[PDB]
């Protein structure tokens, strides 16, 4: 191969691998913040659905 080919192919490899490495570091930091705060789409453990609540007028008033 030409040294141009190896050289620019190496630059392509280094761009792809450095972008993957920065995305992995961002993935670690995103997971840390979402586990700490719970305000992301991940780590959303379920609570009780409020579509189960009966809002009908019950038998006794004080409720």
């Amino acid at each position: 191969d030409a040294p141009e080919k190896n050289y620019e192919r190496t630059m392509a490899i280094l761009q792809i691998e450095s972008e993957k490495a920065e995305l992995r570091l961002k993935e670690l930091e995103v997971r840390r913040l979402m586990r700490a705060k719970g305000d992301g789409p991940w780590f959303q453990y379920p609570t009780i659905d409020k579509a189960l609540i009966d809002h009908s007028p019950k038998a006794t008033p004080d409720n």
Binding site: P57, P61, D62, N63
Partner: protein, 57 residues
């Protein structure tokens, strides 16, 4: 937390229906017919306010 607010014992005085349960049950259907409107105002107030303190009058 906060002080729970209770009405005075003068807010709770009213002349009582001092009759027995059979006396109430014997006139029950005529009581439901004739005393309909304040009873239904009270039970609407009771299921809406959800509080015996807002229903005293």
């Amino acid at each position: 937390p906060g002080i729970v607010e209770l009405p005075s014992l003068e807010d709770l005085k009213v002349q009582e229906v001092k009759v027995s349960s059979s006396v109430l049950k014997a006139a029950a259907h005529h009581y439901g017919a004739q005393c309909d409107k304040p009873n239904k105002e009270f039970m609407l107030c009771r299921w809406e306010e959800k509080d015996p303190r807002r229903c005293l009058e």
